[PDB]
Amino acid sequence: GDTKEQRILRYVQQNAKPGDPQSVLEAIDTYCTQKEWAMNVGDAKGQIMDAVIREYSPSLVLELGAYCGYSAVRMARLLQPGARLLTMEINPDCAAITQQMLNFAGLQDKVTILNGASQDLIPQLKKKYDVDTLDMVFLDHWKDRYLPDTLLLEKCGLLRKGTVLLADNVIVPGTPDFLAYVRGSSSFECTHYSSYLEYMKVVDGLEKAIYQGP
C-alpha cells in the first residue's frame, strides 16, 4: 500500500491551508507526534534553523537531503523575495513528495528540487545550475557524507568567506568525523546548538560551521 511519506503528504493536503507554509509545518509536526515518527528536522531544531536563517538572510541556499520537504518549507518561507533554495534528493519518491509539499505550501517558485546523489550533482552546480558561491548549506543527508561533501564543495569553489554550513543530526545518528574536522580546522568557525531529536526526548544538535577561506 502507501508509504509513510505519502501518508504525511496526504495529511498535510487535508489538514493544512494551501499557500500557508506555517500550517504545513504544523500539520507535519502533528502527524509525526501523534501518528508516525519521521525523520523531518522537527520543530525543536527547526526553531534554531529559523533563528540562523533570519540572522544571515541568505540569497542562495543548498540543502543536502530533502526527505518530505519539511526543512525546505521551513527555510524557503523565511527567504527574501528573489532568494533561492536548491535541494538535492537521491530518492525519487521523496523528490516527488517534496515537490508536492512545496507546491502545496506555495513555495515552488523559490525552490528547485534536484533528484540525484550529492557526489554527482555538486560538481555540476556551477556550469549546469549557474551557481557562483553558496551563502548557506544545510546538511541533512547521509551522515557519513557530511565530511566528504564539505570537502567537495570546497574543491569545486562553491564556498566563500562567510558561507554558513548548518548540519543536522551531529549527535544522533551522529557525524563524528565531520565534527572533529570542522572543529579542528582553522578554515571553520564552529558553534554547537544543543537540542532534541525530532519528536523525541533524545538529545541531538545542530552544528554551525562558518567557512573562513583557505
- Least separation in angstroms between CB 137 and ligand 769: 12
Provide the mask over 166-205, with x wherever binding to Mg ion is found by CB under 5 A and - wherever it is not: --xx------------------------------------
Which of 41/131 has CB closer to Mg ion? 41
Listed in sequence order, the DSSP H helices in 3-137 are: 4-15, 21-34, 42-56, 70-76, 92-105, 118-121, 125-129
- Cross-strand partners of 189: 210
Binding of residue 156 to ligand 769 (CB under 6 A): no
Instruction: Write down the catalytic residue from 5, 40, 43, 143.
Output: 143
Q: What is the DSSP letter of 37?
A: -
Binding of residue 168 to ligand 769 (CB under 6 A): yes
Decide: 206 and 48 in contact? Cβ < 8 Å.
yes
Q: Is 43 a residue of the active site? A: no
**Burial tier of 180 (Cβ tally within 10 Å: 0-12, 13-18, 19+):** exposed
Region near ligand 769 per CB under 6 A, out of 82-90, 96-104, 124-132, 187-195: 82-90
Residues of this chain, 106-125, that bind ligand 769 according to CB under 6 A: 117-118
Instruction: Write down the catalytic residue from 169, 204, 207, 208.
Output: 169
Q: Is 91 a residue of the active site? A: no
Tell me the C-alpha distance between 85 and 62, whole Å: 6
Q: Which does 150 bind (CB under 5 to 8 A by kind): ligand 769, Mg ion, Cl ion, none?
A: none
Q: How many CB atoms lie within 10 A of CB 43?
A: 19
When binding is defined by CB under 5 A, the residue of 43, 140, 149, 207 that contacts Mg ion is 140
Q: What is the DSSP letter of 138?
A: E
Binding of residue 207 to ligand 769 (CB under 6 A): no
Provide the mask over 120-149, with x wherever binding to Cl ion is found by CB under 5 A and - wherever it is not: ------------------------------
Give the pairing type, strands 136-139 and 164-167: parallel
Region near Mg ion per CB under 5 A, out of 95-103, 137-145, 157-165, 171-179: 137-145
Element (H, E) at 211: strand 203-211
Tell me the C-alpha distance between 38 and 213, whole Å: 36
- Cross-strand partners of 165: 137, 209
Which residues are known catalytic residues?
A: 140, 143, 168-169, 198
- Using CB under 6 A as the criterion, which residues of the chain lie in contact with ligand 769 when the complex forms? 39, 64-65, 88-90, 117-118, 140-142, 145, 168-169, 172-173, 197-198
